[PDB]
């Protein structure tokens, strides 16, 4: 399952 | 053992196309699903036939998390831009790694969640899941920012939970393709290279999974010997080769070994005109 | 197919300055310029661009919807196909609309927020442009109401990617790309997901406080305004400015921020109510 | 930037034996940045039917790639692979030994 991702 | 990996690839190409997001899920050695920003789709695609049952709610809610870091990543690229401080100008590679590996039982043993900016470390979840490793400055700027968002504890949670029960699934749903294990079908090949030496070369073909060991020996001591990196057939199999040069008459010497998890017992092979 | 690209952008000021490139076949090779449907009838008496096309002075007469081939000789045709459209969209010809937020400028992250453009010049369209953005600007009708026009952009679900400054433009019923010149810019902000700090009167001063290493801490009044400090470290491990609190009103709420991220807030600090 | 040359490899996806359809591999990797232009070809021509796998990297974050045609080898015709990078001034081509 694809992950929540985040800004730099 | 198994293991689950994402990986995903965002290029700036200024002037010649538009940033593109590429990610790829892998089950092992096995790719099963693909995203491309630069499809008419725009949705996650099934890539394994084990995974097409998988239903309209499981393509609708991976697109919008994949789409989403398609847009967060792309824009990670014109962030990386500032705090580098670098021309609006030059093409730019935003690489992330995530996924975790499981045990024969079916419980968690490691995670992983990477980026790469140019091609460089940037920043990486370290192996206890709960801090940042930061590669430069730029990076502790996303660490320290990461630590205020609390990242850590939802891709830990995540990374133990939810990718750890997706793999489990994933390996029932496709087992007679994910938890099949192809032995090597193994044959040696002598050529003449000079009057004195000769070259002798172990090949290995239609191995799944990748991992494999091709070693060779002379009277029983290791050898280190040319070794191919393990090569997709295409099929999903794998092929590799070891090559060493043995003097004229000393063929009967040198012995090659084969180690994979589809054989009971390690492989020993011997030059035999 | 070659990929046809403006430089700096297609979004462009009367004397201005935009490139047109083409590149085909790996560089930016020699080219021909198509306006509109005209795909087999190339602009400009079929001059060859021999590296790019710079149009130095923009007129109106440069807006348009350009298509370019690039040249290949072992080629049956010599030419390539049809590459992507760009359309170059010339500004400054009508006077600037206004561009308001709804409810307002901060908006927390994951909720939409409303960008209202609007004039008392009767525009057809609205064209709403996020600054620094390579993508065509969005386009909304104009809705004609109390001899005012207006039109309302949705931006959301709130990410830090939607945050920054906003701008934008009118077009006439019969010159749309033709733009007004571009309105004042709005810069949108978003809250969270950065833990929010703690806000207290010290034991006076109101404290933003965090072990998060917010590098700016911002003061907020429910009336609305800004004050601004730099984070100092002390007492334990904790990052927080101490704001002066003056020698008459309450119900104040703080957000950490970070450097070389304007436009990217925590969430606020509960309420404070100060007597 | 880091910049990375790539490996190349050429091979059949069967054991060859002329006559006999099979598929033709140019396996590319190690390599960075990710653009990369390959070609399969046969007799110095570049083949126009070939496939390709979706780009991924490996833990180095090295890109790799598959490429591949179906294709019925001869004693006749030669095959090879030409790969262009940034890396290179000029296409590197590796030919498919059967020896
Ligand atoms: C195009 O020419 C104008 C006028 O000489 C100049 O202002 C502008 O910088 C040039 N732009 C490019 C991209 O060459
Ligand atoms: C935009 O939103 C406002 C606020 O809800 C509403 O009153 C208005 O009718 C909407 N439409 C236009 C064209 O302003």
């Known amino acids: 399952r694809y992950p929540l991702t985040f800004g730099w | 053992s198994h293991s689950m990996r994402y990986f995903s690839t965002s290029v700036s190409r200024p002037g010649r196309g538009e940033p593109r997001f590429i990610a790829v899920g892998y089950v092992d050695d096995t790719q099963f699903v693909r995203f491309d920003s630069d499809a008419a789709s725009q949705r996650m695609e099934p890539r394994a036939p084990w995974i097409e049952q998988e239903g309209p709610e499981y393509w ?214 | 197919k070659p990929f046809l690209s403006a430089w700096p952008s297609a979004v462009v000021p009367r004397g201005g300055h935009v490139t047109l490139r083409c590149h085909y076949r790996h560089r930016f090779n020699n080219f021909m310029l198509y306006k509109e449907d005209r795909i087999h009838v190339p602009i400009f008496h079929g001059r060859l661009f021999q590296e790019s096309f710079n149009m130095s002075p923009v007129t109106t007469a440069h807006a348009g919807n350009y298509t ?175 704001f002066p609190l003056g020698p008459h009103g309450g119900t104040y709420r703080c957000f950490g921020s970070f450097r070389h991220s304007p436009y990217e807030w925590s969430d606020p600090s509960d309420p404070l109510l100060v007597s | 930037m880091i910049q990375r040359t790539p490996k190349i490899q050429v091979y059949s996806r069967h054991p060859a034996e002329n006559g006999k359809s099979n598929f033709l591999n140019c396996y590319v990797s190690g390599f960075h940045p990710s653009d990369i232009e390959v070609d399969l070809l046969k007799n110095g021509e570049r083949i126009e039917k070939v496939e390709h796998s979706d780009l991924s990297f490996s833990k180095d974050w090295s890109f790799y790639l598959l490429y591949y045609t179906e294709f019925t080898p001869t004693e006749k015709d030669e095959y090879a692979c030409r790969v262009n990078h940034v890396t290179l001034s000029q296409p590197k081509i590796v030919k498919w030994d059967r020896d």
């Open chain 3, 68 to 242: 370019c081939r690039g040249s290949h000789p072992h080629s049956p045709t010599g030419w390539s196909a049809a590459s992507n459209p760009v359309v170059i969209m010339v500004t400054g010809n009508h006077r600037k609309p206004s561009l308001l937020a709804h409810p307002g400028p901060l908006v927390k992250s994951g909720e939409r927020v409303i960008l209202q453009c609007w004039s008392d010049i009767m525009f057809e369209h609205f064209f709403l442009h996020k600054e620094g953005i390579s993508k065509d600007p969005s386009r909304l009708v104009g809705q004609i109401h109390d001899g005012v026009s207006k039109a309302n952009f949705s931006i959301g679900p709130m990410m830090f990617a939607l945050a920054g400054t906003y701008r934008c433009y009118g077009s006439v019923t019969h010159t749309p790309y033709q733009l007004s010149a571009p309105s004042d810019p709005l810069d949108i902000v978003v809250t969270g997901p950065y833990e929010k700090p703690s806000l207290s009167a010290q034991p006076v001063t109101l404290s933003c406080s965090s072990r998060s290493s917010y590098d700016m801490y911002h003061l907020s009044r429910e009336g609305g305004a800004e004050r601004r400090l730099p984070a100092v470290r002390k007492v334990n491990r904790t990052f927080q400015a101490d």
């Open chain 2, 60 to 273: 609708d809610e991976e697109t919008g998390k994949v789409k989403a870091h398609s847009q967060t990543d792309r824009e990670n690229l014109r962030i990386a831009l500032r705090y580098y401080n670098q021309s609006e100008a030059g093409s730019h590679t935003l690489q992330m790694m995530f996924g975790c590996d499981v045990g024969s039982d079916g419980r968690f043993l490691r995670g992983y969640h990477q980026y790469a900016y140019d091609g460089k470390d940037y920043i990486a979840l370290k192996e206890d899941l709960r801090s940042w490793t930061a590669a430069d400055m730029a990076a502790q700027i996303t660490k320290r920012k990461w630590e205020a968002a609390h990242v850590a504890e939802q891709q830990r949670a995540y990374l133990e939970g939810t990718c750890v029960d997706g793999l489990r699934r994933y390996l029932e749903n496709g087992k007679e393709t994910l938890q099949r294990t192809d032995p090597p079908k193994t044959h040696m090949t002598h050529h003449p290279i000079s009057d004195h030496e000769a070259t002798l070369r172990c090949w290995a073909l239609g191995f799944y999974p990748a991992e494999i060991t091709l070693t060779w020996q002379r009277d029983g001591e290791d050898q280190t010997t040319e070794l191919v990196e393990t090569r997709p057939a295409g099929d999903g199999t794998f092929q590799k080769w070891a090559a060493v040069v043995v003097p004229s008459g000393e063929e009967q010497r040198y012995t090659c070994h084969v180690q994979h998890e589809g054989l009971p017992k390690p492989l020993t092979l011997r030059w035999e005109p």
